Design an enzyme around this catalytic site. Structure first.
Site, short mmCIF file in Angstrom:
data_model
loop_
_atom_site.label_atom_id
_atom_site.label_comp_id
_atom_site.label_asym_id
_atom_site.label_seq_id
_atom_site.Cartn_x
_atom_site.Cartn_y
_atom_site.Cartn_z
N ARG A 120 0.83 -1.23 0.00
CA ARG A 120 0.00 0.00 0.00
C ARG A 120 0.86 1.27 0.00
O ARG A 120 0.52 2.24 -0.64
CB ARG A 120 -0.92 -0.02 1.22
CG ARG A 120 -2.00 1.04 1.37
CD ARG A 120 -3.04 0.93 0.28
NE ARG A 120 -2.74 1.73 -0.89
CZ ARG A 120 -3.28 1.56 -2.09
NH1 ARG A 120 -4.07 0.51 -2.36
NH2 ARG A 120 -2.96 2.39 -3.05
N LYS A 155 2.58 26.18 -5.07
CA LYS A 155 1.33 25.67 -4.50
C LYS A 155 1.39 24.16 -4.59
O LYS A 155 0.88 23.55 -5.53
CB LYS A 155 0.11 26.21 -5.26
CG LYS A 155 0.03 27.75 -5.24
CD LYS A 155 -1.33 28.26 -5.77
CE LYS A 155 -1.38 29.80 -5.81
NZ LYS A 155 -2.72 30.35 -6.20
N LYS A 187 7.36 41.68 -6.70
CA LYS A 187 5.96 42.12 -6.79
C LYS A 187 5.83 43.58 -6.43
O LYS A 187 6.80 44.20 -5.99
CB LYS A 187 5.09 41.29 -5.83
CG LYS A 187 5.11 39.83 -6.11
CD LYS A 187 4.12 39.08 -5.21
CE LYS A 187 4.10 37.62 -5.57
NZ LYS A 187 3.14 36.87 -4.73
N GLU A 216 6.61 40.54 -11.30
CA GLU A 216 5.17 40.39 -11.51
C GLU A 216 4.59 41.77 -11.89
O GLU A 216 4.90 42.79 -11.26
CB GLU A 216 4.49 39.88 -10.24
CG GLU A 216 3.02 39.49 -10.45
CD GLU A 216 2.30 39.09 -9.17
OE1 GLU A 216 1.86 37.93 -9.09
OE2 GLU A 216 2.20 39.92 -8.23
N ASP A 237 0.06 39.01 -14.33
CA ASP A 237 -0.92 38.64 -13.32
C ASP A 237 -2.35 39.01 -13.69
O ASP A 237 -2.69 40.16 -13.77
CB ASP A 237 -0.57 39.37 -12.03
CG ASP A 237 -1.46 38.98 -10.90
OD1 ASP A 237 -1.58 37.76 -10.65
OD2 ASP A 237 -1.99 39.91 -10.26
#
Ligand SMILES: [Mg+2]
Lengths: 297, 302
Positions: A120, A155, A187, A216, A237
């Site tokens: 498993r 992410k 940014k 960005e 963006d």
């Protein structure tokens, strides 16, 4: 060109990743076996497996019931090494291979109790990493006919950053920065703090020579300013298709343009067709559709 | 003394809820440390964040984490640990608690502290909340399909590596129930163990002997195997790929003797119909093997 330079950055990141993988593989595998065994690495903790005679040797095969892209053999190998190394595995596929339904992935031979305890855990790694590679390849198909390339993001499911970035690579995607230590993502907040884009970039290049610098931008004016300030890569963006085409025309191939924000499998192609060089997709590593596997003795 | 199946199942939940509580703080720390080290390149030192170094060191900022979709919240402890591990300078005011139902654009928390630290920790904290909330949210969706029935949702051992305890917890937050945590706390007897022991009663008595208090579950593919398993003393019977009529026959044959758990190709589409056959539980691998992360967003006020 800057777009080709990013392909080089992506390979440098995959290189760093391959260098760190042995340690990351060992770490995830130990933590996974420990959770399953109840805080120990002793396979004798598997009470159901103890109903099988200690001396039995068995052979099992792991099969995929679904099409996709394979990834995870290094992790499955480590599972069995951590359990004592008595099980041997013959792999019938390699990382990155295309899979068809009911294709045999590998054949395992060793003490029946070990195979039962490791099965498993080995499949949980394979189904996860294969799942990510499979999703990645589906996204990559939407780019057909364009020169656009897919990039991952930060992410990622916790504890599996390096494994998932590797699976993205296996599925035909490219790696963006591994973390906050290997590249800059400038940014608005940083631009204001430094007093302008050119100043932010200069500060970044002076503090960490050699590190890639991405900026960005939320508007065409910002894009133009970042291009004038010589930025390597510019992240667009939440730009509309119209703004993307305009950005590509304004840019004139100078910087590498990367689109980010609200990208779904259903609109990826249209974004790529605007002429942007890269599209970042958090969905490749933030979500998971595990490949369905079966283990047969 | 008398112990009903309801009592046996409650006792089982008490034990594993107890196991999870004792081990959770260590797992939270372990997962958070591994996650921060991956993001910072081998260290827990926030100074490794190069872009954050462009912000003046002494700036103190405030930000909020917002959910952009409805669901169930989960992960407070993990997000807290991210900031504790980065130095504890960030203060977090939670506007929700694990298990709470969320609406789109609802504020989860407001964070305040050194700007560089908020910038370094934000993605990390969000990665935990979106994962655990995603699992809790999906679970709640399945639980909603069980409403009119007495059927309960169980998790499995098909879990994303390294997150077994976090996901077992998220399933609980979403209203699901926890099955065995691993291979050490309960038996899951299958055909190979039965053949090895020479039959089902043989397998079951050998199991109770080796580990007396451990619950015994037996996987069956037919009604005949079911009846042997129940009359041989299994606590729980896992029905493997039974048709709807086989489930109904199973419930009739059982006559409340053992707890019945369905394990098959059961999705949101047929969950209700399967629950309506009278089976006590439905185990769903999908709750912990797959992930639909909750969409979050972080807004800096200052
Ligand atoms: Mg289309």
């Amino acid at each position: 060109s800057n777009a080709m330079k990013e392909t080089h950055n992506s390979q440098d990141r995959l290189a760093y990743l391959k260098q760190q993988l042995p340690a990351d593989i060992t770490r995830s595998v130990i933590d996974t076996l420990k959770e399953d065994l109840g805080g120990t690495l002793d396979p004798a903790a598997d009470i159901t497996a103890s109903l099988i005679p200690a001396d039995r040797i068995s052979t099992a095969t792991i099969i995929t019931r679904e099409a996709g892209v394979f990834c995870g053999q290094l992790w499955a190998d480590e599972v069995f090494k951590q359990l004592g190394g008595q099980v041997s595995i013959e792999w019938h596929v390699q990382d990155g291979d295309t899979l068809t339904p009911n294709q045999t992935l590998c054949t395992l031979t060793g003490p029946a109790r070990i195979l039962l305890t490791g099965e498993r855990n080995a499949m949980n790694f394979i189904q996860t990493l294969s799942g990510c590679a499979t999703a990645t390849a589906r996204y990559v198909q939407e780019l057909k006919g364009t020169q656009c390339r897919l990039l991952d993001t930060r992410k990622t499911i916790p504890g599996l950053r390096s494994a998932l970035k590797y699976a993205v690579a296996c599925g035909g995607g490219y790696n963006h920065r591994i973390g906050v230590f290997d590249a800059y993502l400038i940014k608005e907040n940083h631009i204001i703090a430094c007093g302008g884009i050119r100043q932010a970039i200069s500060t970044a290049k002076q503090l960490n020579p050699g590190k890639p610098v991405e900026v960005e931008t939320e508007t065409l004016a910002e894009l133009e300013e970042a291009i004038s300030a010589g930025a390597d890569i510019i992240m667009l963006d939440n730009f509309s298709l119209e703004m993307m085409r305009e950005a590509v025309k304004i840019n004139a191939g100078r910087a590498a343009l990367e689109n980010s924000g609200n990208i779904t499998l259903d609109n990826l192609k249209e974004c790529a067709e605007t002429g942007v060089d890269y599209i970042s997709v958090g969905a490749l590593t933030k979500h998971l559709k595990a490949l369905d596997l079966s283990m047969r003795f």
